[PDB]
Write a new protein. Structure first.
Ligand SMILES: [K+]
Ligand SMILES: [K+]
Ligand SMILES: [K+]
Length: 249
RNA sequence: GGGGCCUUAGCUCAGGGGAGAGCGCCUGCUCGCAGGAGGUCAGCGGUUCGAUCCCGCUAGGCUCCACCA
RNA sequence: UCAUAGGAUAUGAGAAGGCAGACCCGGGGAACUGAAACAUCUAAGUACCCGGAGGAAGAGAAAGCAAAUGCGAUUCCCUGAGUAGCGGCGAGCGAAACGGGAUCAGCCCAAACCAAGAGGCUUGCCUCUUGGGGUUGUAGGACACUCUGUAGGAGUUACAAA
RNA sequence: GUGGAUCCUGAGUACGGCGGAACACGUGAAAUUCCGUCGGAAUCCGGGAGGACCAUCUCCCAAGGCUAAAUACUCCCUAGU
RNA sequence: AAGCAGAAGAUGCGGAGCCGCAGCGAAAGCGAGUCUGAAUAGGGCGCAAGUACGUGGUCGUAGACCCGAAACCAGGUGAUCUACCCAUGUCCAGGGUGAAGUUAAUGGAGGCCCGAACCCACGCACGUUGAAAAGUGCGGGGAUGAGGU
RNA sequence: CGGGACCUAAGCCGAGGCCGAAAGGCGUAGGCGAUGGACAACAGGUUGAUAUUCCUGUACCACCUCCUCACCAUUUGAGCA
RNA sequence: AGGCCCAGGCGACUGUUUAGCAAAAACACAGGUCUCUGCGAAGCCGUAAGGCGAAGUAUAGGGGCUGACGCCUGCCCGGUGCUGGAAGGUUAAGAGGAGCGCUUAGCGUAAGCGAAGGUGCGAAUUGAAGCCCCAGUAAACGGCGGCCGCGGUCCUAAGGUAGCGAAAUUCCUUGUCGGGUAAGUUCCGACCCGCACGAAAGGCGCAACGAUCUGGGCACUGUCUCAACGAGAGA
RNA sequence: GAUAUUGAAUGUUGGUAAUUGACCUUCUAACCCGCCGCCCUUAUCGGGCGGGGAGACAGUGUCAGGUGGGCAGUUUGACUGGGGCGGUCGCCUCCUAAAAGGUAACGGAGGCGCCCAAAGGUUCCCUCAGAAUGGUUGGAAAUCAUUCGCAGAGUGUAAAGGCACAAGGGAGCUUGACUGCGAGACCUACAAGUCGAGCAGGGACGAAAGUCGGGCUUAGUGAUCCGGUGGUUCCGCAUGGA
């Protein structure tokens, strides 16, 4: 009841369900695997669960959408308890190209919910996707086209997964509106519109406060400029602006 | 009057090593591209191997003081 | 309910209060001041308040001092010595023992145990109250032994008390 | 006076931790003494002290009491300086 | 020296104690030397008249040449003045206005009005070694109230 | 007449009691405490100096019984309370 | 035995106050609001006992601010306070003793090693409130922008709304214009470049009230032009 | 918050070999009641007795942390053409400074709170700035070459005094940027500061003479107390240790 204040009002929905997962693992003494919780929902769950222990794995290390195991003080989990299936996306690579937008659009097009798949990995040699094992056969059967490319899915082990723009700058403050303006190369008044409407996120939390102070190692997500990361804050200049470093995706 | 701070390209700002970056403005190309435009670095005189970034002064603009009989 | 609380009556040269503005032992306890400021510190356990006294008080018969072919209760004086030491190691604070003197004195219990009685029988055990017993350190006492005294010695200043 | 079969010889004490005070000694290397609090012995094959502490040695026997004199003082009284 | 004897004396006794006769070194220690140092070196400090008592000068600790704060602390004494409160009394000439209510009249409200006592103290003058350590005179405010006493 | 031998308010004191280094603080029963309640005497006269106080006249209140009279009554028995 | 009138500031009012240089625009006030307080209330006095609160009980009691009435009371929760709180971080005594030192029975030609006990330190681990942190809250403390050409741009927690404005606030200033006067640094009304108003440390109005402050009139006068005479007290 | 007062049970979860912890719930008997009835007792005190409530909590004690101008004791510099405000405070160099030395002002100018493992030591060798004339890049100015050339350069750094038998530049080998000291001087209120031949130990460089106890010279620093570290033929509170 006195947890919601710490999160947003829309985020209440997840928090209610996150409390219902903790309820199970305490009383029934059994691990609860979840449906690839979003990077934000990782942060929320971590809080709602409390310290019921928690584990998280999205197949490869550095998956955005990862599935969480809520386990007690015993039954420390394995890599396959997360019920993850990796696939290699086969297509006529010489003729057609698959991009992240097309493959994401195709996954959604076959009716797959965002919670039923993790990250879509693009390397030089392979395009791979990670899904929940319960949906693996459905996705393999239905995902026959991505954009203009005819595609097929080959099952692989997680071990077979084939896993910047540094921009040293100065800002007046570490307010959100100031950092966005700097990163996105805009007027601050324009950046304030972005923040206020609800287009910027900070670690996948929608921050609508222009004056929110941004810390070192915060993934900002300006809808319109993509995504960028305050990696370094490096003291202050002669004329008193924060020496900073940005790295766009 | 005294102290304290400021003076960089159209605009916003980076920056003892020979003055940049974005945006605007121009180049051709149709939300990104592709090269330009533009600086007495307030000025002055000097420290020196070179000064926007030393150091001393002059502007100007702000800021704080100018009290006690 | 037994009781007990409470109430009543009797007997008490029982207490109370005072002061000598002193001395003594306790409880509580400043500040100015000094430190060339000031907080630790100092002033000072002072002043002051309170309680208790007594003609004196307090201390006192080694769980001591010491480091000798030792000393032998305590108190007080001389000395040790402005030493040792303590100390924003500042300002300041400051011993003790030995040595020399004054004066001198040593005692009683508690306990073991014994005897008698009482009330809890916990049922031959336990607790309590009188009297005896006993009093200490290279241990003493109980307890046993054999001795020995029961009236010479001691006494109201402790060591019983008129 | 002689014996050491047993028994007795001061317990919520000594002592310790924490917090204070007293010791010339200000927490210090800090013995010793006392108070509050909490913990808490041994008991003669025992215990205490000798300035942290241990060992050895030496000296002593706490946690019960009493005790004159030498000492302090003078509102007074007497005699005097 | 205390102390004992002795006029509250001198004095006698009393050698514990004190200072000096040897220094050097932090110290163990060594000693006319010693410390430093590897050193017979060099250098430091030493070697090569005190003491007891008295007078005087000065210093220390004491109030310390005398007089003087504003203050600080401790323990008492004061609410007969004054502040507020509590209990219980008491005071407020006269006149006016005319709320509610009642049936234009009636009615008699009020930190209501004018205005003595009473309370107050706004202005000015006077007084200022006063009549008076806060007043007097002329005016002034409140005067049934959060009133005076 | 005013006060006491009557009453109580505020407050104060306070057996036992509660609390507190000491001293003490607080407080019950119970008291004290008028500024309040209650309560019987008036007019005139008089002295240099007192007067509901003395004097004159006429009163009233409480209490008492050597007495007088009437009435009621001696254990459902007056009456007091 | 009332002088009166016109106009303005302040405070609504009657009250109250610096005994003895200030009576006021200061305090109080009825009204408003915020807040605490479930009763052995909170608050307060007292070491406590005992009390007040109250012989009351949320329509009550305490505290803060505001100050009749009328219209109203804007924006900012970053900071500070208050209230509440999830993760994460931090943190006392106490608890806990892994280790280590000193000591020495023993053991070693010595050097040194070294049981047990005593003793002196002692790490991990554990450990509340609080704090960091997060959320709310402005009739809480407070704060309510620059620059350039309504737009741009920088900065901020957010940039002053309504109303008022040379004001008990305006330095410059005797601002400017108008009114009143023969002549008006004061006064009144406008204006707004508000040095440095502004919404309960309330804003703007406001009838009644004032020994309030301020400007102007009528009346009146020895206040004055400008003095003169008389009475009394002192001299 | 710990701990005492402070107990009993049931669960559950630690840690030791069945005892002792931790926490949850329950219990009643301590403790509490500014609740009711009864009694002491004419009593809204107090106490006793019986109900009820609450309960090992609270309260109180000790200890601990937090908060805490509610309260307490204090501090809050000096110079200064009055004080405040501004500026300054130690060290070095120059000028003022009057041809020894010293010498003031909120007089005039600047530096310092280091740097360097060579930018120290020694041995050997050397000479700089700039200009003229000639040169593919290449220019006024890089690199040659020639002549001229008291220094017009350099000397880690401020300035002054010095320095070309170099104190300036280069190279080799090195660690004397030594230990013990020190006749005697300078400076000086003290405290400190400065110079020093020479002696010993053991070195570096050099054939040797010799030079070397940092740097061309003069700034580059801070008393005591207290505490840390290393060393130590010292002391060690009966003795041996500590
Ligand atoms: K010598
Ligand atoms: K003398
Ligand atoms: K002057």
């Amino acid at each position: 009841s006195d947890i919601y204040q710490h999160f947003r009002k829309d985020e209440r929905a997840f928090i209610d369900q996150a409390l219902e997962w903790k309820r199970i693992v305490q009383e029934q003494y059994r691990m609860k695997l979840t449906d690839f919780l979003d990077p934000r929902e990782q942060v929320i769950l971590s809080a709602v669960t409390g310290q019921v222990g928690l584990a998280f794995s999205g197949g490869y290390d550095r998956a955005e959408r990862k599935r969480a195991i809520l386990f007690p003080e015993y039954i420390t989990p394995e890599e396959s308890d997360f019920e993850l299936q990796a696939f290699n996306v086969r297509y006529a690579d010489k003729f057609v190209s698959v991009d992240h937008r097309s493959l994401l659009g195709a996954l959604m097009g076959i009716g797959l919910k965002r919670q039923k798949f993790g990250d879509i990995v693009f390397s030089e040699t392979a395009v791979q996707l990670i899904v929940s094992a319960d949906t693996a056969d459905f996705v393999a059967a239905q995902l026959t086209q991505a954009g203009k490319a005819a595609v097929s899915l080959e099952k692989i082990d997680l071990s077979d997964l084939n896993i910047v723009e540094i921009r040293d700058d100065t800002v007046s403050s570490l307010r959100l509106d100031a950092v966005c303006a700097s990163m996105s190369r805009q007027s601050r008044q324009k950046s304030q519109t972005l923040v206020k409407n609800g287009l910027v996120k900070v670690n996948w939390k929608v921050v609508e406060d222009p004056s929110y102070i941004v810390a070192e190692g915060d993934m900002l997500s300006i809808r319109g400029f993509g995504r960028c990361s305050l990696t370094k804050i490096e003291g202050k200049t002669k004329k008193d602006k924060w020496r900073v470093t940005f790295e766009r995706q």
